[PDB]
Write a protein that binds this ligand. Structure first.
Ligand SMILES: [Zn+2]
Ligand SMILES: [Zn+2]
Ligand SMILES: [Zn+2]
Lengths: 59, 198, 237, 199, 197, 144, 157
RNA sequence: CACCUAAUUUCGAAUCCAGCAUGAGAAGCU
């Protein structure tokens, strides 16, 4: 009753998707060993709900 | 003709899985390193032949149950065209109703394929007389396939599922007597019409 | 289930309770936008609100209100941890590799590329070998030796096939092949020959390996037409 | 034909079990910590080769008995196809009727797998001249395998059980001289139909 | 063919100590004891037995004047021709004599105790160091089986001579302090290899 | 010497303002004209060098009725016999010493080997008969 | 333009064409250049984003590796492991050869395989130093030359 | 009947092997 009065949901015993955002121009890609790899230079930014990969212009 | 049966098969490996490389160029490229390479794609994913295993399962089970079922296993044996696996998998004239896809892996060769060492040990001196390297697919690796049955019947799915549990009992791929190829199959079926695209 | 209110869409799905912005009475898991009072009058405080630059300042207020705010092929990380905290941002100074598969895009480090470069190096090196593209016995003696080693399965159809492939690559490649095959292992004591069938001891087996070595050595000095007419009789392909 | 034999074996370990890791990349990952990794699945359970042990046991005893059995242990030796173990475990033109599964532990890694230290001592000095670290399976660990005999005969279960008792006497895999791999077997067999899945 | 079975029954005359070897069983036990005795997971005592037989036979056969390889030196290679090479293995062959571990007939709650040893200064006679070690009690019975695959007329004699050298020297660790003096009883028999059929 | 890329530059990446591409081609010296060509190139010339090294009466008709009735002497057999023939007939009857696999069609095993021998006999005799006679004989059995 | 930036040696003669198998990087004034460029560029940008040998003759190298291979100081496991650390760079190979060669102060046991024969103590340590100097000087050579040197001793490198 | 102690050090590597053998066909519609 007092956390319902604090307006937070209470159970008495939804989907969250931690997604990885690329945010990188992947149109410039090459084939070496039957792999579509790209040499990459950026930063793994770890904010909540989103581990976005951000380039050097973001920095 | 107005409906089709879609059987999505997701198979995981409980035992290490080996099926042999078939492409000569890929196989002669691989023996510079390994003696028994695993059959893979050109997109580095593991491929297993699937129609032959399901057909062989249905022929052994249906011959042992007692139905009039032909045997296509023998050398240059002709399918009769009258049994239920001739209708389901193929005949010499009529095509097969079940278009059984290949078992395409979800991961590539660096994740699931691992080259290992097999032996041949003398029984008296207990020393390794021979040694050879062979690739194998790891346990817990998952594979996807789709069985599309056109002109379906009521008992086609029961036959396919019984063949799948027989493949769980025996194994798929090669080296089945040594413990390889034991798998577990998950089945998602569905009725479709052929004009979903229309 | 989609109710309405004063323009408010309240689409209930099996996953989440969206509210596109009177207020409802149930849980509003996602809210899309004095409004703070519109937030504060609404029961079961929303999980994450979905909010021109004034927005961000408003989002700071939404940050201060203890409410998450978002401002508008699967990708996997095979990375490390390291970490850092610079300008209220948890970071990682890493340069790597974006690998594109049919369903997954993965982020791999330079060590995986060194793995791939070692494999590609070892693949390239075993393509071009030496100069791609002797004893002597009579032709009939070569016939009866190849017949005798065919019957006892020392020279098999596969060995004749690789002999013909190494003979088409030239003289020196075939010399390298037979010196590799007849190489007695000093630490093991076996050569790369099929053992003969029959009740034999070590001396005649070693002698038969020696005549296999001498027969395949003396066949190399002959031309390609004689070698082809010598080996079609045993290996038709 | 109409029936097939199912032989479920449950083997418990009495002295520590080693069976070496086969995968070259799994070896190269594990040699930074353990010099002798144990054979393991990707699902972190212990794999043991089983078909070769039963086959070698049957060839050793049927050769000592005097029966016509080929040996498939010498270098590049081929099976003739007319023996008694040639029928059970295969030959060049025919496969083995007894498909023998790998011995897979009921428990997992980090529960039966224990990494240990082994020694080599000078005889004149009594000092640890060498040291290595090997990965073993503890005693009392339980492994489960299945043998599927496709065309059963009257003497298949007796031959399989006799080979199992020889594996109890000699050890199943690894350093069998030092005392590793001494196990015991529990056998449960039934003649199932071939068409049991055809409901 | 024939196989030689030597069932050895070992009674422990002085305390015995073979240290644990598993990392997860030592580092979980250093808060309780400093030298845990070597054990099974079924709470039974393990003693390595093939190495003691091999070390015994190499000492006595080396001092008798016969050519034997010395596998005691670091990274040594067995010659493959000597008597201990034929019995206990070599590089390229295997041991005819498969030597089991010395399994105790009792658990650890019956025949393992936890002792307190010291280290005493010489000038002042005071307990300078203290450590605790698990030892096997006296009269604990251990059993093992030596299985010889291709037996000769001189394998049982060499095994018995190695056993007598073990009772004279000691088995396991802490041998110079008096730990590990044992007594051996042998039951030898010659079975047929096809006996399980 | 002047050096020419035969490789495809139409797949690239931008790293550190350098337009780079991992490649696995072979450098070839060719008479003061160096080149770097792909793996396909070596596949093509390995194939070219391999091909360059590669540059070096009533009872008879009744037996054909029985054999084509159980389809051991089938339509493609009659065609390839017409296409021919002694070396062909030698090559389609010779038992493989390893597997015992005669290249005929399946029709007891003693009757199977007698039928196989019957075919070899009938096939050899019809080649003895002159053309046209056999040709007409063979048309109403497999018209082609 | 093309600047090859690689040694044009190790040129075998397949058919009538002096080829030479290669794996490198094309960088645009186009310049084909080897793995050393990728090491330089990777170190350069990987540290720019972190901001918040003995010389003995080739014939003597081959002869000494052959001699130490016959007496089993250098073995197929050592020639393969040293090749793996050589592919990892010229700094991992230095670390691996130093780790194998070093005398542990408590034991005195070098990590080499002991020689096979009747060599005395000073000769054994001289051959250990010969293995150290030979495998140290072998690193100063390029990957292709190292590969042709050790491919005779270990055919499955 | 008490009381103190219950720690510490070295090693944790080395080697062999990684090969063979078999099968490359035939049908129908057309
Ligand atoms: Zn049919
Ligand atoms: Zn046989
Ligand atoms: Zn010796």
């Amino acid at each position: 009753k007092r956390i319902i009065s604090k307006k937070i949901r209470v159970e008495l015993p939804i989907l969250i998707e931690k997604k990885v955002v690329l945010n990188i121009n992947t149109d410039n890609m090459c084939n070496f060993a039957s792999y579509r790899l790209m040499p990459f230079s950026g930063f793994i930014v770890e904010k909540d709900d989103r581990i976005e990969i951000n380039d050097k212009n973001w920095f | 003709a107005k409906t089709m049966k879609k059987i999505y098969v997701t198979m995981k490996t409980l035992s290490p899985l080996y099926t042999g490389e078939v492409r000569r160029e890929d196989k002669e490229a691989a023996q510079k390193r390994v003696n028994f390479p695993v059959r893979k794609t050109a997109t580095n994913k593991v491929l297993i032949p699937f129609k032959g295993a399901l057909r062989s399962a249905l022929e052994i089970m249906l011959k042992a149950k007692g139905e009039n079922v032909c045997d296509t296993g023998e050398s240059r044996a002709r399918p009769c065209g009258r049994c239920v696996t001739c209708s389901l998998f193929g005949s010499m004239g009529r095509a097969g109703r079940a278009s059984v896809d290949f078992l395409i892996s979800n991961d590539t060769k660096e994740q699931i394929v691992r080259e290992s060492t097999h032996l041949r040990i003398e029984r008296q001196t207990k020393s390794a007389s021979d040694t050879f390297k062979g690739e194998e697919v790891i346990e817990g690796a998952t594979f996807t396939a789709t069985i599309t049955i056109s002109n379906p019947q009521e008992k086609d799915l029961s036959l396919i599922q019984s063949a799948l549990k027989f493949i769980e009992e025996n194994g798929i791929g090669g080296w089945l007597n040594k413990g390889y190829g034991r798998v577990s199959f998950e089945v998602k079926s569905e009725d479709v019409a052929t004009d979903r695209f229309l | 289930k989609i109710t309405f209110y004063n323009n408010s869409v309240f689409i209930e799905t099996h996953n989440g309770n969206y509210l596109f912005s009177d207020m409802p009475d149930g849980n509003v898991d996602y809210l899309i936008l004095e409004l703070i009072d519109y937030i504060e009058r609404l029961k079961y405080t929303p999980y994450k609100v979905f909010l021109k630059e004034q927005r961000e300042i408003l989002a700071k207020r939404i940050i201060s209100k203890k409410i998450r705010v978002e401002l508008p092929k699967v990708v996997l990380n095979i990375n490390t941890d390291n970490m850092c905290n610079f300008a209220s941002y948890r970071l990682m100074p890493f340069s790597g590799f974006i690998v594109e598969k049919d369903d997954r895009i993965e982020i791999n480090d330079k060590n995986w590329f060194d793995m791939i470069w070692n494999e590609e190096y070892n693949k390239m090196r075993s393509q071009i070998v030496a100069e791609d593209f002797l004893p002597d016995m009579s032709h009939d003696k070569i016939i009866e030796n190849i017949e005798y080693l065919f019957n006892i399965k020392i020279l098999s159809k596969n060995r004749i096939k690789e002999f013909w492939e190494e003979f088409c690559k030239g003289q020196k490649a075939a010399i390298k092949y037979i010196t590799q095959v007849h190489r007695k292992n000093p630490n093991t004591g076996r050569r790369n020959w099929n053992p003969p069938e029959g009740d034999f001891t070590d001396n005649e087996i070693e002698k038969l390996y020696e005549t296999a070595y001498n027969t395949l050595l003396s066949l190399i000095k002959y031309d390609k037409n004689k070698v082809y007419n010598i080996l079609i009789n045993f290996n038709p392909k």
